[PDB]
Amino acid sequence: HMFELSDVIEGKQFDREMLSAIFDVAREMEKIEKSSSQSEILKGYLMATLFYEPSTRTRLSFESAMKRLGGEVLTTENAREASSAAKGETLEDTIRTVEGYSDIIVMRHFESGAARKAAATANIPVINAGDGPGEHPTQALLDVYTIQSEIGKLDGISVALVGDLANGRTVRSLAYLLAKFKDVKIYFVSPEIVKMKDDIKDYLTSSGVEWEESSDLMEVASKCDVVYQTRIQRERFGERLDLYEAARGKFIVDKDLLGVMQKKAIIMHPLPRLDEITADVDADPRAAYFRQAKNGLFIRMALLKLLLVGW
Amino acid sequence: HMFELSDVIEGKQFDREMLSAIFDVAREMEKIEKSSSQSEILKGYLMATLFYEPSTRTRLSFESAMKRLGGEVLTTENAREASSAAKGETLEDTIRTVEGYSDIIVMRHFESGAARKAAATANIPVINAGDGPGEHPTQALLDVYTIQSEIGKLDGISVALVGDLANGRTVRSLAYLLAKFKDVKIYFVSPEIVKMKDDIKDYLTSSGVEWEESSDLMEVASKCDVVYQTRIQRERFGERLDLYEAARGKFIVDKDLLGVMQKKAIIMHPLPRLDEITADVDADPRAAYFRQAKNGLFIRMALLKLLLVGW
Amino acid sequence: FQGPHMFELSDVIEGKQFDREMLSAIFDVAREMEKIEKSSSQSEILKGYLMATLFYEPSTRTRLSFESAMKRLGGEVLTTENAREASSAAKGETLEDTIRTVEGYSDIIVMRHFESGAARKAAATANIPVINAGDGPGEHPTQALLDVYTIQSEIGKLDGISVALVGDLANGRTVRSLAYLLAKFKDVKIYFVSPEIVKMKDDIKDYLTSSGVEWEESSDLMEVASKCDVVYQTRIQRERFGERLDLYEAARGKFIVDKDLLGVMQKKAIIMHPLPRLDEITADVDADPRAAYFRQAKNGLFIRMALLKLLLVGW
Ligand SMILES: O=C(O)C[C@H](NC(=O)CP(=O)(O)O)C(=O)O
Ligand SMILES: O=C(O)C[C@H](NC(=O)CP(=O)(O)O)C(=O)O
Ligand SMILES: O=C(O)C[C@H](NC(=O)CP(=O)(O)O)C(=O)O
């Protein structure tokens, strides 16, 4: 029974029914991962990774997921310097040739739109591991799985998206997924120079999702189930380091912020964090960003299985 | 029965009978690669890769070949920065060390002659994945396999070698292999500054192989079974990027060139290409460079099997 | 059916963690691993386990020997060959956050870092075993383990021997950890032979004096070498000199292992070097049977197989 997606590129590809089904597979993958026996579901399949930007979680969780299911991995951990991209090769030619050696490609690129172009080129599945400041659909998938796992529900919740929303490929993809549930309220909390872009706002409005911008993080956090913090995306600011430092340091998750949050609310962060979540938050049971990262293993196991061998 | 070569370093090591037999094995490997069952021919064997220059096809095709045969791989994707070559270690000490962890070494180096020095140090097989602007024997092997596969014949054909011939480790090795067949005519088409070096010319003349220099690519291409285009090798020009740019734009494979070529002729390119084959050409069935790269998987599977377990 | 018997260490971070009886037992395991590595059968001892490597400094032997060891035992590896450029350390992530995240994907972490003390911090953060593959100029405990194994294998003993530690002692994380392990045996005499600017640091000297280990500084390598069982040469640690290249160059060329040095050494003595070498062991020496540094490097495979097995599945 074939998986309905040929590639995982954009958050809009997912409907509510598909998300619930993927979450069920991820819970089964958690059982496999905990098990003593080595799974062979993906024995014989090869994944090629192509990372043109740095990564710890997304690269290693995809590789670990593949190996835990019995598959193998062909890595390119720095494609800008060590692949023939360094000789001038286009992404499209890279994808065309790498598909000759592999069964699925995981690619992170520095240009928005790169993953869509890769999927159009390739006749094997492509997974977008982040395309510039564009999208990050598997982050969004594991984020919603984490919320459902931590809060117990997705309908009716209030979610604060905090920090660099303009450049945040994570919060952009997450916004698309949250719009598939009902009675979700989203607060945008950011410096004005990195407010959420109009393509997301217009999509949410067209989808009848209530959203509000606010600069009062303590007030917003007091009434949210989820506070989703982000890193200010320095690599997207070019030479405008004045604007980078202007956007930094203005919205911090600290012990005082936790003190106004409900007992059953959570803090999330796709990671890495710099200064925007203080270290003393980590000890709070509501600090969910390391459980969130761990959950990416099971979500990516589920996606690799579904794309390669189906439901 | 053991393979007659202990290392794969230079095109001159091959003879016609050996080439034919390797191609026969590559065709069997294509059946293995297609099959549903994961092969175990090389279970228990370990390949070490040592890439001191960038690579996409050569590095990933060797790793994929090894894993498709059931073996494993110890990768060094950027030996200059991430291996103890960065501390000043010689190539010979690197090779002597790495053989303690592995059964076969695949090395791409920036100095011509490096692969022969590695083979002389090692007591396990070494494969030259490119040694500066010197040679690239497995590229030449897959190139001749591709010509036989596409054209149906090697004896009697006409082959144009186009582009940066002086620095082209690909065309240098290919010339050595073409010399092993009967009545091959080779055309050299290049800017004067990157014409084929005298060592190749003298070898061909001494071996009775007809070659001809021409600056009229349209005329040459109308007469050839194979037009083999190359990238101008920017990394060999040092800081003389003025002479590099001056050598570009003079010999382009475009739809106009395809328009004068015979119906049964092909375009080849070891890749990557920049501007020297236009995107239009890819849609012509005669554009063989992506099939060529795919064939490298099967040829490299054949070589690994032969070097490690024999016939 | 009583289950595993856990190794007494939870992490391999510092040479002082080892005791004499544990070292002897580890060496026995390494000899068993040599039989496994040589066998035509693929071992499955570590089937299903994953090692994450995190290399923030260059490596050939340490990185590849750990990966080869893991695979020869049937385990798998998640590599980060250049963590500074290709991991989210490049975005500014702390070591502690990196370790906490990477343990979610793996069962053991092998880390080489540029700061002394990094491995201690990683072990404190992680709830899976961490192995220190080198923490700045601090320590290199698995080099020291394979070094002592090599001495036992080549010389036949560790008690009573004389060992010359030669070269850059100040910055040598290898000789620093080796000194801690040599102190666990009886009547070992240690000679320090170095340029003054890279003499052995006081923390090691004070530890040896407190442990009753006789040590002596000398500038006469021919004299020292003639009365030692082991001459352990090192590379002058260029990267630790940073911009002070004039001091680096002046520390070179003073203490060379060459054919003349071998000529004054005993028949049964050996030359060791954790590698890489530059000029400080001449090529001539490689042909002498006493030149042990490539056997030493090979022995690292067996010692690291032993450590991975012990830390993941026990005795
Ligand atoms: O980098 C961020 O701040 C968020 C996000 N982070 C990740 O995906 C985690 P990693 O970079 O470790 O794979 C990204 O967009 O890459
Ligand atoms: O680089 C070229 O232009 C031709 C040739 N290309 C290859 O081998 C393919 P790759 O660099 O992707 O491994 C080379 O000499 O490396
Ligand atoms: O670098 C040296 O001179 C000694 C020592 N060398 C090693 O561990 C071997 P490698 O760097 O190849 O892993 C080190 O401290 O890293």
Residue numbers in the entry:
A (entry chain C), B (entry chain B): 80 to 390
C (entry chain A): 76 to 390
From the paper:
However, much remains unknown in plants about the unique organization, regulation, and localization of the enzymes required for de novo biosynthesis of pyrimidines, which are potential targets for crop improvement and weed control. This metabolic pathway starts in the chloroplast, where aspartate transcarbamoylase (ATC) catalyzes the condensation of carbamoyl aspartate from aspartate (Asp) and carbamoyl phosphate (CP)1,3. In general, ATCs consist of a catalytic homotrimer with three active sites in between the subunits that can be allosterically regulated by association with other proteins. Each subunit folds into two subdomains of similar size: an N-domain (aa 82–221 and 374–390) occupying the center of the trimer and holding the binding site for CP, and a C-domain (aa 222–373) bearing the Asp binding site.
To further test the role of the CP-loop, we replaced F161 with Ala (F161A). We also determined the structure of F161A crystallized with PALA. Interestingly, the structure showed a trimer bound to three molecules of PALA rather than one as in the WT. Although ITC indicated that PALA binds with high affinity to only one site per trimer, the high concentrations of PALA (2 mM) and protein in the crystallization condition must favor a low-affinity binding to the other subunits. Importantly, the three CP-loops fold in an active conformation, have well-defined electron density, and show no steric clashes around the molecular three-fold axis, since the bulky F161 side chain is missing and E160 adopts alternate conformations. We also found that F161A binds one molecule of PALA (KDPALA = 0.12 µM) with 5-fold higher affinity than WT, in agreement with the enhanced inhibition, and also shows ~100-fold higher affinity for CP (KDCP = 0.7 µM). Indeed, mutation F161A does not only turn the enzyme insensitive to UMP but also allows the binding of three PALA molecules per trimer, suggesting that the reaction can occur simultaneously in the three active sites. However, the activity of F161A is not 3-fold higher than the WT, likely due to the obstruction between subunits acting simultaneously.
